[PDB]
Design an enzyme around this catalytic site. Structure first.
Site, PDB file in Angstrom:
ATOM      1  N   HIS B  40       0.804  -1.222   0.000  1.00  0.00           N
ATOM      2  CA  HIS B  40       0.000   0.000   0.000  1.00  0.00           C
ATOM      3  C   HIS B  40       0.840   1.277   0.000  1.00  0.00           C
ATOM      4  O   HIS B  40       0.278   2.364  -0.138  1.00  0.00           O
ATOM      5  CB  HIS B  40      -1.048  -0.010   1.118  1.00  0.00           C
ATOM      6  CG  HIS B  40      -0.507   0.199   2.497  1.00  0.00           C
ATOM      7  ND1 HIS B  40      -0.507  -0.793   3.455  1.00  0.00           N
ATOM      8  CD2 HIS B  40      -0.019   1.306   3.102  1.00  0.00           C
ATOM      9  CE1 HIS B  40      -0.008  -0.312   4.580  1.00  0.00           C
ATOM     10  NE2 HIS B  40       0.298   0.959   4.392  1.00  0.00           N
ATOM     11  N   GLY B 142       3.052   5.541  10.256  1.00  0.00           N
ATOM     12  CA  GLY B 142       4.414   5.326   9.806  1.00  0.00           C
ATOM     13  C   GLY B 142       5.013   4.004  10.227  1.00  0.00           C
ATOM     14  O   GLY B 142       6.151   3.695   9.832  1.00  0.00           O
ATOM     15  N   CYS B 144       3.992   0.969   9.424  1.00  0.00           N
ATOM     16  CA  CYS B 144       3.832  -0.147   8.503  1.00  0.00           C
ATOM     17  C   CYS B 144       5.184  -0.639   8.001  1.00  0.00           C
ATOM     18  O   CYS B 144       6.122   0.140   7.800  1.00  0.00           O
ATOM     19  CB  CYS B 144       2.942   0.239   7.333  1.00  0.00           C
ATOM     20  SG  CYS B 144       1.232   0.369   7.872  1.00  0.00           S
TER      21      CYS B 144
HETATM   22  C1  LIG Z   1       0.939   2.146   7.996  1.00  0.00           C
HETATM   23  O1  LIG Z   1       0.927   2.695   6.685  1.00  0.00           O
HETATM   24  C2  LIG Z   1      -0.370   2.417   8.713  1.00  0.00           C
HETATM   25  C3  LIG Z   1      -0.308   1.955  10.171  1.00  0.00           C
HETATM   26  C4  LIG Z   1      -1.494   2.425  11.016  1.00  0.00           C
HETATM   27  C5  LIG Z   1      -1.685   3.941  11.118  1.00  0.00           C
HETATM   28  C6  LIG Z   1      -2.340   4.126  12.477  1.00  0.00           C
HETATM   29  N1  LIG Z   1      -1.842   2.984  13.232  1.00  0.00           N
HETATM   30  C7  LIG Z   1      -1.381   1.994  12.471  1.00  0.00           C
HETATM   31  O2  LIG Z   1      -0.939   0.909  12.875  1.00  0.00           O
HETATM   32  N2  LIG Z   1      -1.483   1.782   8.004  1.00  0.00           N
HETATM   33  C8  LIG Z   1      -2.538   2.452   7.524  1.00  0.00           C
HETATM   34  O3  LIG Z   1      -2.683   3.676   7.667  1.00  0.00           O
HETATM   35  C9  LIG Z   1      -3.620   1.625   6.816  1.00  0.00           C
HETATM   36  C10 LIG Z   1      -3.453   1.697   5.309  1.00  0.00           C
HETATM   37  C11 LIG Z   1      -4.504   0.933   4.513  1.00  0.00           C
HETATM   38  C12 LIG Z   1      -4.447  -0.554   4.793  1.00  0.00           C
HETATM   39  C13 LIG Z   1      -4.368   1.204   3.019  1.00  0.00           C
HETATM   40  N3  LIG Z   1      -4.918   2.094   7.272  1.00  0.00           N
HETATM   41  C14 LIG Z   1      -5.172   2.114   8.589  1.00  0.00           C
HETATM   42  O4  LIG Z   1      -4.484   1.568   9.426  1.00  0.00           O
HETATM   43  O5  LIG Z   1      -6.299   2.791   8.889  1.00  0.00           O
HETATM   44  C15 LIG Z   1      -6.492   2.928  10.320  1.00  0.00           C
HETATM   45  C16 LIG Z   1      -7.612   3.904  10.636  1.00  0.00           C
HETATM   46  C17 LIG Z   1      -7.742   4.218  12.129  1.00  0.00           C
HETATM   47  C18 LIG Z   1      -8.700   3.165  12.637  1.00  0.00           C
HETATM   48  C19 LIG Z   1      -9.588   2.902  11.453  1.00  0.00           C
HETATM   49  O6  LIG Z   1     -10.710   2.397  11.461  1.00  0.00           O
HETATM   50  N4  LIG Z   1      -8.917   3.280  10.339  1.00  0.00           N
HETATM   51  C20 LIG Z   1      -9.386   3.104   8.967  1.00  0.00           C
HETATM   52  C21 LIG Z   1      -9.713   4.430   8.300  1.00  0.00           C
HETATM   53  C22 LIG Z   1     -10.595   4.246   7.046  1.00  0.00           C
HETATM   54  C23 LIG Z   1     -11.870   5.031   7.389  1.00  0.00           C
HETATM   55  C24 LIG Z   1     -11.425   6.472   7.351  1.00  0.00           C
HETATM   56  C25 LIG Z   1     -10.678   6.681   8.417  1.00  0.00           C
HETATM   57  C26 LIG Z   1     -10.565   5.396   9.181  1.00  0.00           C
HETATM   58  C27 LIG Z   1     -11.964   4.830   8.906  1.00  0.00           C
END
Ligand SMILES: *[C@@H](O)[C@H](C[C@@H]1CCNC1=O)NC(=O)[C@H](CC(C)C)NC(=O)OC[C@@H]1CCC(=O)N1C[C@H]1C[C@@H]2C=C[C@H]1C2
EC number: 3.4.19.12
Lengths: 302, 303
Positions: B40, B142, B144
């Protein structure tokens, strides 16, 4: 929930661990530049240990009596001296993995990471808090002496603890890297007891700030206290009195939340005097005292 | 006397790098001449809700990936995708690559996590793979590409790479072949997990650890059959205990002189009666993220 004990990455310390043997006694040492630091009781036999005369034991030793090894590779000793309860062995090779480092003496309540080691080989890493009675609740077995505790800030490893002994209650005691014991303990195989322990108030306050940061704030009240009045009440509940340094290290969390330290103290005072009344904070009825203000900021903000 | 202990992280620290694509930065794992990271990293805001990863990746070039090992940039000379992981071939081998394998762990097994930000290691802690295939981690923006691992002798077994946080605050990720643990997907949506359960064999292991450390207020004079225990366990959303679990608990049973089914009777009493203010090894709750091996390895000093 949400928080957990997190250790610092141990690689910079792993690269400094060696073993030191005198006769059949092997413990761990710390190799920094061209010096190896270890507990002085490596020079003791079983018999020397009740009432060791360390000065006399050391005078009978020479450089060639110390076997220092990094893995199975021997490191030649070219000098030796004793500083309080630590032996400093000068060696003929500067450790190429020496990190930026300092030796620090920590205060009760401060946390640090322990790299538990046996025969110079690391087994595990975990976070410990220095209790107000100057013991730690470690996981240490025979052969663990000379394992160190540390914190890492930017590139720099601050070494704060070297392991020496286990007390009858199963808690642990040791020195800073200048060989001065934390607390009243001595490196002799004698009867010693830890003082009655107390709750680390500054860390409970940090925990309450963490709860507020996470939106859990039912325990905040409209009142304040002086530091002296709080300290006198705290002692009645077996909580440590706060120092000025404690007030200062709560500064960042106070600024992040807008809750003055003494206002949070008034909230804690009410919790002590009235109890939780069936309520929880961060999911628990028990107040946590082993997360420092720095630990909270590390896990809440990164 | 008994602590949640992570593996020493140095062998993994030497493999962590920073990977950037566009305005997205995360961590990668550099082994030999390949950097593994979450795919991603290639997504933008307009892609993240339904990213057609094969279509997005074919449009990228090697030079769109910036890989940094400390103060040194590594030239990407090829790339491929394996499930949810990107594999960036670089023109330089990592001399710090440990002996390693990639494994897929089973629910209830534990591992160490090296949490990293901007390719820099920040903390290390022990986690379990939950029965619902989440992990109760500590990960921020950050993080990931941070990895989970176990160490046996000289060999690092990588079992987890971090991808996402769920709305409940637990975490989800993949093995190092890029297959998710659990029913999760690398799209930017709020995802719920299945109902979690408690890892019974691990609770029993920890009760044995408590006895080893002189804590025994929770023991009783009674016993239970395996099936009667399992009926109660399931009622309380605890995982079933199998005969293999009983066998695995043998060494701890032999050490303390407490039959496995006698410890099951103690745990049954705790489930039905609670702990009533008491604590076990400092915990007010029953702890389920120590395996039998973890308890033994910590009572034996393995390095
Ligand atoms: C690494 O890139 C990162 C690690 C996360 C960031 C916060 N804590 C972690 O461990 N991963 C992401 O940001 C992923 C990326 C996706 C898989 C493409 N997304 C993610 O972790 O999203 C987390 C957030 C917070 C909790 C939740 O429900 N959520 C999903 C998003 C999508 C909808 C809009 C905002 C929230 C709900």
């Amino acid at each position: 929930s949400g928080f957990r004990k997190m250790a610092f990455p141990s690689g910079k310390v792993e690269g400094c661990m060696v073993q030191v043997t005198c006769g059949t006694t092997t413990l761990n040492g710390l190799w920094l530049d061209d010096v190896v630091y270890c507990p002085r009781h490596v020079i003791c036999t079983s018999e020397d240990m009740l009432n060791p005369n360390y000065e006399d034991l050391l005078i009978r030793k020479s450089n060639h009596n110390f076997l220092v090894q990094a893995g199975n590779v021997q490191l030649r000793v070219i000098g030796h001296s004793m500083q309080n309860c630590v032996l400093k062995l000068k060696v003929d090779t500067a450790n190429p993995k020496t990190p930026k480092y300092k030796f620090v003496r920590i205060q009760p309540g401060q946390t640090f990471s322990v790299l538990a080691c046996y025969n110079g080989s690391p087994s595990g890493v975990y976070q410990c808090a220095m209790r107000p009675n100057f013991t730690i609740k470690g996981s240490f077995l025979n052969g663990s002496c000379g394992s160190v505790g540390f914190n890492i800030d930017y590139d720099c490893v601050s070494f704060c603890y070297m392991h020496h002994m286990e007390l009858p209650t199963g808690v642990h005691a040791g020195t800073d890297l200048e060989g001065n014991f934390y607390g009243p303990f001595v490196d002799r195989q004698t009867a010693q007891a830890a003082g009655t322990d107390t709750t680390i108030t500054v860390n409970v306050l940090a925990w309450l700030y963490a709860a507020v940061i996470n939106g859990d704030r039912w325990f905040l009240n409209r009142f304040t206290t002086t530091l002296n009045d709080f300290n006198l009440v705290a002692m009645k509940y077996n909580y440590e009195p706060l120092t000025q340094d404690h007030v200062d290290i709560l500064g960042p969390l106070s600024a992040q939340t807008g809750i003055a330290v003494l206002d949070m103290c008034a909230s804690l005072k009410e919790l002590l005097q009235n109890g939780m009344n069936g309520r929880t904070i961060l999911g628990s009825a028990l107040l946590e005292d082993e997360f420092t203000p720095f630990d909270v900021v590390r896990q809440c903000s990164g």
